Design a protein around this ligand. Sequence first.
Ligand SMILES: OC[C@H]1O[C@@H](O)[C@H](O)[C@H](O)[C@@H]1O
Ligand SMILES: [Zn+2]
Length: 288
Amino acid sequence: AAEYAVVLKTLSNPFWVDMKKGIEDEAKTLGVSVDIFASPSEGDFQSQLQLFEDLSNKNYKGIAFAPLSSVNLVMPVARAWKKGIYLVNLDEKIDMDNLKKAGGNVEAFVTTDNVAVGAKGASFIIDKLGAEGGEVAIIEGKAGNASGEARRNGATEAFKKASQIKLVASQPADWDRIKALDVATNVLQRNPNIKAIYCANDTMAMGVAQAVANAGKTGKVLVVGTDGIPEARKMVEAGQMTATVAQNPADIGATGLKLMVDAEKSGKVIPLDKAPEFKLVDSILVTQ
Ligand SMILES: OC[C@H]1O[C@@H](O)[C@H](O)[C@H](O)[C@@H]1O
Ligand SMILES: [Zn+2]
């Protein structure tokens, strides 16, 4: 096997496509051989565990990964840490209590500050709704995923500080476009006076926009996404989405690879009771 392996969520989402490119570019800068893989879809928890196990069973020196769920890679990651594989968690926080209970750790975790992402999206909505405020909803990612949970907490905490805002719904749409359209339809049905919906990612935000359109409410219901994927940036320019909190997956990926290579130079994996190296990549609100 090459020196390093990378496990991304799914290349069917531009966020992960850009993270692969960032890693590829960084690999050339560092001089390292990297094999980059991804599961076929967001719901492939089991096959991602198998993918991780297959790479962990090869002799890569390090494996950088973004788990599809907080817990689906706890067991294989613990196993890999025990084998002395230098592990870096990209983007989506593996459940660290669960991992410590399974006897492993990760050298580092590189991600966006996801609480700030949800606070930016909510703060923008609050601003746009102005003095009168109104009812708002959050369309979360997969419940329990650290990335979505942080965005949810950041947005919820911001909305709770603004009394003119009424959070009427907070539901998971599992990073899925179809599911988000369905969840937004139901939310719009139950609370037809809703004025804005923060979505924990662009894949979901796009489907939420279609629900809003079906309801004859485009522009009357703000829709804010997260990631800054190409189609969502286009929708934001065209008024189909109000805004998106853009991330820089290329730098998450490059920075994670660099942390992994750096860790390998130490010659031992991180101790179980040492906090992983932590690095945050900025986000930025993208509006019309
Ligand atoms: O794969 C779904 C999503 O996972 C999150 O952890 C990433 O930060 C991006 O929001 C991505 O779109
Ligand atoms: Zn080899």
